[PDB]
Design a protein around this ligand. Sequence first.
Ligand SMILES: [Zn+2]
Ligand SMILES: [Zn+2]
Lengths: 56, 49, 158, 119, 215, 147, 119, 56
Amino acid sequence: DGPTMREITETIAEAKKKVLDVTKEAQANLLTAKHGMTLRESFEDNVVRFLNEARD
Amino acid sequence: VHRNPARLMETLRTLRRKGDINPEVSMIRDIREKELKIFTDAGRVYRPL
Amino acid sequence: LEPGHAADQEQAKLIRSAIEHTTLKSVTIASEIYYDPDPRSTVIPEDEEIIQLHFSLLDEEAEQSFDQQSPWLLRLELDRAAMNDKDLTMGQVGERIKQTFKNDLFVIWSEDNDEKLIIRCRVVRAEEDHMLKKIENTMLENITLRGVENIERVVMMK
Amino acid sequence: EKEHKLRYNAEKMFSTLFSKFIVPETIEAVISISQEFAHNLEEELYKACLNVEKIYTEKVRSLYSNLKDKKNLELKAHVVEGKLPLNKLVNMNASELANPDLQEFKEKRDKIILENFIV
Amino acid sequence: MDQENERNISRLWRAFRTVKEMVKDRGYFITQEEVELPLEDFKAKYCDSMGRPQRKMMSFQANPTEESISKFPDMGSLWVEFCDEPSVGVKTMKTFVIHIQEKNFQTGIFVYQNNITPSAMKLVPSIPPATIETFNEAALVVNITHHELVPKHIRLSSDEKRELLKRYRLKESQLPRIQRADPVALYLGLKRGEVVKIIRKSETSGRYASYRICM
Amino acid sequence: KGSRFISTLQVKLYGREGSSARTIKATLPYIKQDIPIVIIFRALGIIPDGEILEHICYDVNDWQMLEMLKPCVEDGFVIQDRETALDFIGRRGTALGIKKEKRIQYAKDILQKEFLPHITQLEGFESRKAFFLGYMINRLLLCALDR
Amino acid sequence: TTFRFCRDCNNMLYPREDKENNRLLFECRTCSYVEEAGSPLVYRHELITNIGETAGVVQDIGSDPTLPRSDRECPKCHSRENVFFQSQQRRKDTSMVLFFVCLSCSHIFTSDQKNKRTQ
Amino acid sequence: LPHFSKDDYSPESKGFVENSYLRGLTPQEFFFHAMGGREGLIDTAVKTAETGYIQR
DNA sequence: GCTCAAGTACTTATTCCGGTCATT
RNA sequence: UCGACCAGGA
DNA sequence: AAAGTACTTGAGC
Ligand SMILES: [Zn+2]
Ligand SMILES: [Zn+2]
């Protein structure tokens, strides 16, 4: 459905923003790493997550 | 070594685009690492743009 | 966790820090070697108060503990973040070093609250320098401060 | 026997801090009163040691360095002279002695590490 | 460092309990009252004036139970020794080795702190038919037989072994094996040739019994 | 083009990440042992430290990379003359032909023909290869300092 | 550290203690040279490094078309024309902090909202 | 890819495929999808010689 | 000269099912 | 009809 | 194709 397709497009769009926000937070040194993990390892996990939540 | 790399880079890039330097000749300028690498090497795989 | 203390969140954190291996290397920003000739005083004016509390009274005796030590200083600076994060006292760190070299190294330190965390080291009773760089390698690499060997990153789980 | 000589030197330090720390109490919100008050902690820290039957020397420094501090720890040092338990302050000695500025960072760290190793 | 004296005593009391648990499990007369001895009561008995644990006094004798005599009639008395020296000297070992001979003990368990002289351990197979066993203090702090994954190991009598081989038509080489040095075989004081009946729970039958021969 | 002189030069950073005395040695063709860079530089004619150091580390301010070079200066310290370096190169690995006067001559040969055959194989060039070996050590320490 | 060389033979200077006057000297081991030390510091480790972050900032930095642009105003010239990048320290641990280079005054500034620097 | 600016950690840059097989993949989406697909084709080829020997 | 880390040699695999070459 | 290489199939 | 066995070399002390 066209409406379903709008919902799907805005679902990906919102997850992109969620990522960008986590990107801006990590760029301003506000991000804190989840034990035995790099700050980069921590950011990646949460980015991969938001996008896989979105695909689902 | 070179003292004004930008001037030399524009010169060489214009020379190859004219045909004076063979079009297959690879010429890279890493500004961050302060290096000019030129390859006249046989065997390099290239693509047109 | 112990059958009783199964939901005891505080006992979990306690065992977590009791078993996780912690080396001096993990809590050090930089180590330096200074030529501070008279051991009773200090060239570095930053460290002036370190000698004024630890070195003054006591003494460890009056002075007796052989102050004719060595003119070469090993100055270690510790990261307040990683110190407090891994729950450590300057005294804890200091006593662990003083127990490794027994009576071959006169060790002193800045207190837990001071602006900079410093550990001042000097050898005890011809030819030196090269041996000091060997002592600092043994310090960072070997000396265990807290935890059991082979046990890295310990994590809590519900 | 040697113990008394080691205790003697320890008291000398407290009175030195009790003369050069007591000045801002009068500046916002003398050498004789500092001597008596120095002895009040030297025998109080001795209560904490050799129970029923080394640690002490280190407790002396943390009491000296923290109570010295200012202009953040002076607000805590003000309470010490003004009816704040001198008995509790002796067996206190840890992150509790620290500056309100340093205790803000210590609490900011501790509660942030907690969410990282809880997985 | 009052903390290090307090932690050392816990570990020693813990290991003492495990020796008591091991000797009770080996078929010797030890009460559950003896095993579950409190830390307070332990200190009260074996610590000196300064509160320092006197290991010399800990050493004890254990005699086989009435049922132990029925299955194993040749199972004699046992002596357990705890040494206050972290490094157990060759002079100290000779004093121990001779204690067993004169009192005609069957077995002797030496509980050492850090190490025993390579000189001193040459005297171990020197007094037959009696056997000497060595155990490190830290190795005994925790009783490994009390673990989830460690099933009930039972030492079979010579007659019981003879029956197992008859009923299953086996040569000794056809029985699953247990290493002489195996933590449990060490606990039971298993001697080469001895057989253990391992009774364990099964997600298949609820109860399954296997057997292992010492080597 | 020219029989393709396949001579792979290895410039190794001996000593692990945090281990005491981290020296840099290099394997040249037809020489058994690994020679500390300082001796090779001295064999090329570049004799004092800070001429050898100047060829490796370009910025005088970069103390971090220069402290990495102190143990190399100490390794090659034994050799102080170009001939003392050539004799040392000659002695180490084929070699065999015992008599001082000949090992020195065929050490020059290894550096001219086999050490960095690209650039040149001609006699006069020492200076050109000296800077290149320096460039290689610079690239090695740059990765070692995680830059 | 910032170490010196022997004038005359241009070689590495090694430490030497003047036990008489309790002062540090730097001797040449290729000749008879000796010079007084500038600083009491002889060796510096640094486990937690900061040099390598602002690496490769050449004046031609703006001419890299690969580099991304931003509309961030400069703390000095206030020009909304800059070419940014991430810490050039190639370690696993390293944060994703951005370093900006002004396409006017060529001043280096960060996105770092945890602390303030001068590099 | 050379179509992106340096230090780009956006979903598009590090290989997220926003589109569906119906809508069709962009050239970048296509190359990244091929990259991941190649990983599967390798895994299948190796874990046959490996898994095969385990069986024996 | 003895223990012991470490370097060395040298061993070992990987399901079933037409064309071309040179030589047997 | 001695067996090596190359190319494929599931 | 990386990881094991079974020696042997170096050298800590
Ligand atoms: Zn000189
Ligand atoms: Zn600007």
